[PDB]
Amino acid sequence: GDRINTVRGPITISEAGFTLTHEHICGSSAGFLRAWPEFFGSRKALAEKAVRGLRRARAAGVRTIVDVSTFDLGRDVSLLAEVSRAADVHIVAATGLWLDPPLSMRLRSVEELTQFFLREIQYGIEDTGIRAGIIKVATTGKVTPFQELVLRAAARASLATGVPVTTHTAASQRGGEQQAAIFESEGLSPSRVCIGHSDETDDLSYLTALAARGYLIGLDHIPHSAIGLEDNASASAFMGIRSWQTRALLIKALIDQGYMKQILVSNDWLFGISSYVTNFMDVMDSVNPDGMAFIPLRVIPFLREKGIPQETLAGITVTNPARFLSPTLR
Amino acid sequence: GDRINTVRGPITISEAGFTLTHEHICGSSAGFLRAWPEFFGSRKALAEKAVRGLRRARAAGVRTIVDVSTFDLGRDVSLLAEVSRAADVHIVAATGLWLDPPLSMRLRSVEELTQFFLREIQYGIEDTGIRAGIIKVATTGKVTPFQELVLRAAARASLATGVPVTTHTAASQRGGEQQAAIFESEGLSPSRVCIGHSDETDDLSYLTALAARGYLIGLDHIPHSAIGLEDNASASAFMGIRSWQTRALLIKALIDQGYMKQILVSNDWLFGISSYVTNFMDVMDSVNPDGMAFIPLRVIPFLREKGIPQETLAGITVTNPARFLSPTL
Ligand SMILES: C[As](C)(=O)[O-]
Ligand SMILES: C[As](C)(=O)[O-]
Ligand SMILES: [Zn+2]
Numbered sequence: 302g303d304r305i306n307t308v309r310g311p312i313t314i315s316e317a318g319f320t321l322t323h324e325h326i327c328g329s330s331a332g333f334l335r336a337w338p339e340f341f342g343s344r345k346a347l348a349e350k351a352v353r354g355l356r357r358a359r360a361a362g363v364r365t366i367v368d369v370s371t372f373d374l375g376r377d378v379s380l381l382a383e384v385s386r387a388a389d390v391h392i393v394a395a396t397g398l399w400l401d402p403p404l405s406m407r408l409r410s411v412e413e414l415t416q417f418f419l420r421e422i423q424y425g426i427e428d429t430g431i432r433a434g435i436i437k438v439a440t441t442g443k444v445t446p447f448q449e450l451v452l453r454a455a456a457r458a459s460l461a462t463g464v465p466v467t468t469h470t471a472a473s474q475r476g477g478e479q480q481a482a483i484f485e486s487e488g489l490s491p492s493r494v495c496i497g498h499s500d501e502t503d504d505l506s507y508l509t510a511l512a513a514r515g516y517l518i519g520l521d522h523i524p525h526s527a528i529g530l531e532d533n534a535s536a537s538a539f540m541g542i543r544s545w546q547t548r549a550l551l552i553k554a555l556i557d558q559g560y561m562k563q564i565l566v567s568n569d570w571l572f573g574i575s576s577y578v579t580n581f582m583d584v585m586d587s588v589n590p591d592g593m594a595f596i597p598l599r600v601i602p603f604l605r606e607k608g609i610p611q612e613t614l615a616g617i618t619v620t621n622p623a624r625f626l627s628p629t630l631r
Numbered sequence: 632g633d634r635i636n637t638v639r640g641p642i643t644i645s646e647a648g649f650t651l652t653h654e655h656i657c658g659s660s661a662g663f664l665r666a667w668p669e670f671f672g673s674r675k676a677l678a679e680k681a682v683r684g685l686r687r688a689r690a691a692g693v694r695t696i697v698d699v700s701t702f703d704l705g706r707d708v709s710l711l712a713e714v715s716r717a718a719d720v721h722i723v724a725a726t727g728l729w730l731d732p733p734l735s736m737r738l739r740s741v742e743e744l745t746q747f748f749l750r751e752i753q754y755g756i757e758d759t760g761i762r763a764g765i766i767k768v769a770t771t772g773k774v775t776p777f778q779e780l781v782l783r784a785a786a787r788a789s790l791a792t793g794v795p796v797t798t799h800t801a802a803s804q805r806g807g808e809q810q811a812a813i814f815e816s817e818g819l820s821p822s823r824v825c826i827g828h829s830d831e832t833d834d835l836s837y838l839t840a841l842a843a844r845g846y847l848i849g850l851d852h853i854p855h856s857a858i859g860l861e862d863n864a865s866a867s868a869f870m871g872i873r874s875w876q877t878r879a880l881l882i883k884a885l886i887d888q889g890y891m892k893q894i895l896v897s898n899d900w901l902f903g904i905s906s907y908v909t910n911f912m913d914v915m916d917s918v919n920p921d922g923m924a925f926i927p928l929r930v931i932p933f934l935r936e937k938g939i940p941q942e943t944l945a946g947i948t949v950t951n952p953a954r955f956l957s958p959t960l
């Protein structure tokens with residue numbers, strides 16, 4: 302229709318504006334923020350940092366972010382709603398499952414997972430009445446049996462509600478190809494789907510092929526370059542040796558192939574992280590001081606210097622997310 | 632000290648009475664009860680089932696249960712408080728980690744885990760002000776490197792606060808021997824430690840040796856048995872095919888060996904479970920309609936028929952848990 306669900310309620314599509322389609326307020330685990338807030342210093346501290354971060358993104362032109370933190374990424378929608386009001390930035394919340402599902406999720410059938418996702422979309426998250434506006438899923442190269450169940454549950458929940466699906470992929474392993482095959486076996490329209498972390502490869506033919514089938518290509522790891530850390534056993538597996546300009550030029554390459562309409566760009570940033578090593582957040586902030594403002598402050602100007610016109614950069618950052626997020630059954 | 636943290640606040644040891652030492656209101660995962668309460672019908676239905684079940688247990692003489700649900704078993708201490716108050720049964724809450732820690736736990740140092748356990752003990756669980764009176768940990772046969780971190784954190788937390796440590800084990804793999812060695816390397820007295828699920832084995836030499844070192848022995852799976860349900864694979868992989876009377880006779884055994892002061896007895900029951908197959912709660916309730924009342928309604932009289940004196944049984948169900956739960960530094 303004409304309305305997108307956010308943590309503050311429904312908004313009309315024209316209100317979304319410049320939208321970052323793959324972000325996080327906090328990368329954690331289910332129940333963790335509540336049970337151990339001092340891991341982040343304090344809940345208040347984490348919130349205040351996130352509010353400053355969003356206001357900084359807002360002053361760079363960002364109007365909406367999509368928080369693709371799932372249940373098992375320890376999504377706290379109450380936190381999302383708080384920081385959204387204070388920063389005057391729309392936040393779309395996610396259902397789905399990422400890569401750390403607990404036992405109570407891992408043992409569920411595709412039918413039960415479908416019910417969980419649908420409840421979070423149609424009824425609300427926890428007892429908050431806040432509804433998800435996107436379904437997030439994740440696979441590791443060769444899709445596992447449980448992951449296949451997740452993707453099919455996501456497909457079915459999308460098909461009943463018209464909300465889009467967005468994925469975590471290992472692009473180096475061409476992971477989107479198995480994701481796409483599963484989605485298509487369920488009769489899901491590719492234009493409901495973003496294949497994420499896609500800038501983690503130099504294989505353009507892989508990307509272009511997905512695009513040509515109608516998938517959105519999520520180029521969301523541009524500031525995850527991490528230059529110089531090939532000794533750090535934490536910042537050499539996580540992140541690599543590909544410059545942000547190298548990644549960003551994939552955006553240009555896809556535009557030149559005629560697939561500007563299939564491109565989504567983001568940062569995959571956050572303001573706290575507990576799912577990795579202690580103080581990884583300091584590592585990330587040191588390497589990307591712009592945080593969520595990296596896309597509008599660096600990547601957009603870079604693309605302009607490379608001769609990408611304003612109307613195209615507007616289509617990618619405003620029109621493309623809008624079309625993606627608006628619930629549609631085609 | 633002679634006071635124990637419960638979910639309704641501190642009680643004196645005298646108040647605990649008949650204490651079921653290894654139980655669960657709900658077996659789940661972190662965040663799960665609050666994200667998907669309809670899995671249990673509703674949160675309300677779950678609380679009311681648990682109030683009914685505890686009330687029957689209270690009728691049968693139980694005054695206190697120990698809920699050894701950790702963070703990663705989806706312990707919702709607000710649920711525990713509600714059902715405790717409504718059934719007027721004491722509940723002691725747990726910190727620690729079970730076998731399903733998430734990345735945010737799995738990636739933590741022993742120093743960090745120590746601080747988390749201390750927080751739930753000294754400050755409170757989440758923002759509730761409810762403090763754990765016990766530390767629950769779990770290993771699987773061979774202790775994993777992360778599981779070793781958890782047990783050392785548990786020991787350090789215990790030595791700082793005096794609260795006891797209860798464990799989950801595979802008695803088939805004599806899991807308690809590995810746990811004990813880790814605990815003792817940290818300087819922890821065995822009198823601060825219960826080795827649980829010890830009734831899954833019939834190896835008395837394993838039990839008595841542990842007992843002789845001063846460890847508490849948790850014979851807590853007594854009502855678990857999938858006899859007549861052998862063609863249901865999920866039932867006999869979770870409950871086994873050993874009679875409850877056989878499990879119970881292990882209690883007599885340790886008494887006869889002179890070890891009554893080391894026995895703790897329980898049902899390891901619960902009123903909802905999401906951390907196993909769907910509708911498994913109905914299979915459990917089918918096997919044991921008595922729920923947490925199985926121990927005082929069936930087991931305790933069974934032991935008296937086999938000639939065990941009343942005072943010894945009272946020492947096991949009252950005195951031993953009191954001594955165990957009392958913060959002893
Ligand atoms: C929260 As992530 C680093 O798996 O996109
Ligand atoms: C939570 As259990 C059934 O492993 O004691
Ligand atoms: Zn991801």
Ligand SMILES: [Zn+2]
Nearest residue numbers: 324325369569
């Ligand atoms: Zn992400």
Ligand SMILES: [Zn+2]
Nearest residue numbers: 798799800828
């Ligand atoms: Zn157990």
Ligand SMILES: [Zn+2]
Nearest residue numbers: 653655699899
């Ligand atoms: Zn248990």
